[PDB]
Amino acid sequence: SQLIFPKEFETAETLLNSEVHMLLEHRKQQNESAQELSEVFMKTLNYTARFSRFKNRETIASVRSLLLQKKLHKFELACLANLCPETAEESKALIPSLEGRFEDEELQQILDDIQTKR
Amino acid sequence: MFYHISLEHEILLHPRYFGPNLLNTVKQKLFTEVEGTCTGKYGFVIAVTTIDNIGAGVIQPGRGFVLYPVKYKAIVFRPFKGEVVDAVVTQVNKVGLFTEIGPMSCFISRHSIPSEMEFDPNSNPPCYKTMDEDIVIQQDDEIRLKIVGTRVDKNDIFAIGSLMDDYLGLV
Amino acid sequence: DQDNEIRATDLPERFQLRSIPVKGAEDDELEEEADWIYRNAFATPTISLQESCKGPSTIQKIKEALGFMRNQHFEVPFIAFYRKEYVEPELHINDLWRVWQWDEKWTQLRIRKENLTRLFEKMQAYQYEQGIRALDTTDMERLKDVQSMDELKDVYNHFLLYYGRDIPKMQNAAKALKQASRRDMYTICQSAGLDGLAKKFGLTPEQFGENLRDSYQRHETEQFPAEPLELAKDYVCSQFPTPEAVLEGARYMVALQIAREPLVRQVLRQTFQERAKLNITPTKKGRKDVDEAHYAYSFKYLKNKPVKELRDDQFLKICLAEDEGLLTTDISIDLKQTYFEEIKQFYYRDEFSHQVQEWNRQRTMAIERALQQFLYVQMAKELKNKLLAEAKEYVIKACSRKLYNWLRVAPGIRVLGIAFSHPVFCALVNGEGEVTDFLRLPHFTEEREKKAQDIETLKKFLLNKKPHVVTVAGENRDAQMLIEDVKRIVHEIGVELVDNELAILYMNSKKSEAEFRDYPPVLRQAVSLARRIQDPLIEFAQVCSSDEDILCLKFHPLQEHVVKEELLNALYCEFINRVNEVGVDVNRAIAHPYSQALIQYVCGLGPRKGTHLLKILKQNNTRLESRTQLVTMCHMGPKVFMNCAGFLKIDTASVLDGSRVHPETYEWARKMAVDALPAGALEEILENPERLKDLDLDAFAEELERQGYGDKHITLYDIRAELSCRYKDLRTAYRSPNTEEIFNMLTKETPETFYIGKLIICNVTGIAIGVKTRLDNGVTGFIPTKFLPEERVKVGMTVHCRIMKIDIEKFSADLTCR
């Protein structure tokens, strides 16, 4: 969570629920254009299409670029973009590793940018 | 949560597939034998994004099969302990709530939730509910919740959850 | 544990079993269910096809039936046998039972309507202290006139729309854990102040909602004097600076109130309840999986299926089809000229000015977004759910009927059973229900001598102890040989045929076997079978004392998909219909473990009360033939007493206690002993067919008009109808099951496999000449000598193709093989 429970997941890129969604639907249009898909794949695809708070790729690219501009930890870029708290406090009001790291005056700004890109 | 880690596999190829399309066969066998496995070391692998390289295929002495080390970039979901995630509820019960966070199910205790969410009997949608009906969690709703623990069953890793923080309700 | 609390409190047990306790019904509320229940249980015509095996008078009939039991705690069988004069001839007992769960349905809706009024009034207390909607009295009234759980839901969603953001303030009101975000862009656009121009459209959605049920534009579309894009430039803002985005976001704004106006819901509910066509397409997996081998073939090429065209359990099979990608189905009021064309004009203005037309252009596809994204979505699944329950209920209605007939067999008589299986097993039962004897006798079959020595064993058993009816166990042409084995023996009083799946589970049940585990397992099936033809009800009670035993039976192929908890009691209650129809006596319970499971179907009683009464009965060690000894020795409550004591039958061997006459109506039974002219007159009327001809039964009704207990004419006749034959079990007398039953008990032939053109595997019997073929069940008839020759039939192995003709007695396996 705030600290790491395993010992290997530091050196791995983190994805939203929309980066997963846009890559998974690319697989289908590769596959039935050319065997049946696994049930766990279809279930995760349905789940991540349900909670897809970015329905366009360029919104994803802009959000990822601005989250990199915020210069926070690589888990925490995708921890909050696909989460959409309406309260910048909700951010500190939750994730126990994001309060004290940053001050409040940017948080509601990145929240309203996130809900604008929604 | 959802990660993009490059990781390993060992493909045993039968001598049947030793024609012009053996490397393709190694790719399809990696897809067939990796996409959907519930490993405990890396949680849930969802989809193999790409093939990094197909290694040197060592012929196994006396067996005929060829062992190929395959390195692959894959999308991987892993429910870390002590994280707040949005689930979809699929069953209500007195012992707790059975939700579905995607690839996995999830159990939430009746005493781990706040004491304002009580059972609703003899109703055509069965649910937990508040006495003033502030929030109702019927079938196919979104619920923010904090999973408190992760344990390995080696076949389908389920997580136990709770709701002791703000906003951990219907969205 | 809790049965002691059940034993402590004094009430009928099934009322105590209910999740909500029964409350006293004031006469308005007493009436309120009766109209509502009758409308929603009998006056409702089901959209799918309905049949089984009445009028506005039922509205009164249910109403008097309601308060006679809600206020006075009388169970259904007590009304259904003693106080049926309040309801005859309008309702049957299973319909009297069917009323009872609708009491349970009413109780929630009344409770929930109370629950929502608490919110609305609190927000009514919260709104006034602060174009937002006002909490109208019509809003209160829409909560007041709720006549369905669906109607409750729409108001609740509608309430949660304009006031979902009140919940943090309601939490603050509750404080006098906080609520986060929702999902609809509403929440951002509500905070963006878009509701001002949402107010500025053609109509209020409720004003639009009234235009639906009128089928005309009753309230004319209010044209604000601007073109629609000008209101963008008023407050295009940081949310949606684009004038199209506020204008499209207006459409997302306004469509959802259109989606969540409750008046919109019912008219969309009403239109869809009949005007809806079903379109079904198989998936890519369904391309392979749709075939005549699956049941999904009839659903393959069926386009624009009417909702009425749905057969009695057809939609449940449709419901199974989407589960594994067999079939993907869509439902629509339109055909494969839409419904929207009427809807578009009902919210429209016919002026050709581009100001009005762009306003209409704003109005047209906005409400389209309401129609497609929400109303074709949300009401569709609710339509599905309503058809889901009806399709589910028909199977349970059928399975209740299937168990109804199995309890409808009438039962002194000495019965032997033959247990086909080559282990052939045989056993007798006594005239008093005890197993008499049993003998291992392996029968098979060139050489025939190993069967020969045991044929004379059978007529030995005729002359050892002389029986009346001997029974066989119908299997795959095993008891067909055995019905001929016994037929020669009896020819020196008859032999009957009955199936044994209930006997297999009697073997399968541990506790059933646990009395006689040393007795052979396969021989234990005839133990039930001999006792089954002795009596089915005691037999079903013995084999199916546990709950999932009835689940272990197969009343229907689709019996696993219906909801078990409402499945089980539907089957469990029809037991209680039949058990108190004949009665029960505690002497046969304490004597026979064979008859130890009948006590929990007693009206007012059950397992929890009846078991603790059983142990007290063993402590006192004197069983209750005396119905007043229940009152004295057992010290059991009058609410339990005056319900059950009439349904506890007593064998007279130890005289109105040996009748289906309640102790509360023995007084009118004393008035009919005088008509013979204290037990001398009691025997004279009960023994003679001639005291009933002159029995002045209508004369007893004359003083019944004076006292106030009148209209007992059939009830007094029921006392006369009781005394004509003492404890006459009105179940149908046992009948030899016919060829269709025989062909479906021996080969267990599914009538689905009677379908002509169906692939039936059939191995050749050989040349006797046409070649006969044998199926795995064992049907053997010759293929007709016209069509079939190597390529018409391959001699030596099986034949599998289109079937032509099947014989119910000659097992005709006819196949063209070309």
From Swiss-Prot, chain C:
The modification N6-acetyllysine is found at K397. The gene is SUPT6H. Belongs to the SPT6 family. Histone H3-H4 chaperone that plays a key role in the regulation of transcription elongation and mRNA processing. Enhances the transcription elongation by RNA polymerase II (RNAPII) and is also required for the efficient activation of transcriptional elongation by the HIV-1 nuclear transcriptional activator, Tat. Besides chaperoning histones in transcription, acts to transport and splice mRNA by forming a complex with IWS1 and the C-terminal domain (CTD) of the RNAPII subunit RPB1 (POLR2A). Ubiquitously expressed. This is Transcription elongation factor SPT6. Residues 34-818 are annotated as: Interaction with KDM6A. It comes from Homo sapiens. Transmembrane segments: none annotated.
